[PDB]
Amino acid sequence: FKGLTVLPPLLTDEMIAQYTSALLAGTITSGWTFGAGAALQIPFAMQMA
Amino acid sequence: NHNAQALNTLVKQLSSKFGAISSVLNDIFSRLDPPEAEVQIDRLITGR
């Protein structure tokens, strides 16, 4: 080279995908409750109501 | 694309002479006296 290199990111794409999967599972299963304290389950129909 | 173009132009700009006789340090040192090659090296260093 000419002294110009690229450094790898700390978080791999698999880790980011895991974070996204966790967010999707939490929001599908517990609504907005998981973002304000303990995650409380609720059926999806009642959540959308 | 912006990152790639910035790095590519940084690589490409080395070929310019910046007013010196040549853009290669080895030639300047090989075919000039040190008192006369000093100014050429200074010009290239400042440009880079």
């Binding site: - | 006789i21 090989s30 075919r31 000039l32 006296d33 006369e36």
Partner: protein, 49 residues
Amino acid sequence: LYNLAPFFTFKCYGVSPTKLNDLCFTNVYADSFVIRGDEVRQIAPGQTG
């Protein structure tokens, strides 16, 4: 050539006399002609006369 003692003008343009031993020349013209003593002034580049 350095064995010749009476050298009067030895100026070089773009090259150093001491660095000639380590250089190679793709083509060199031994353009030679005999001149008057003071005419060495006009043998210079970008100079009229």
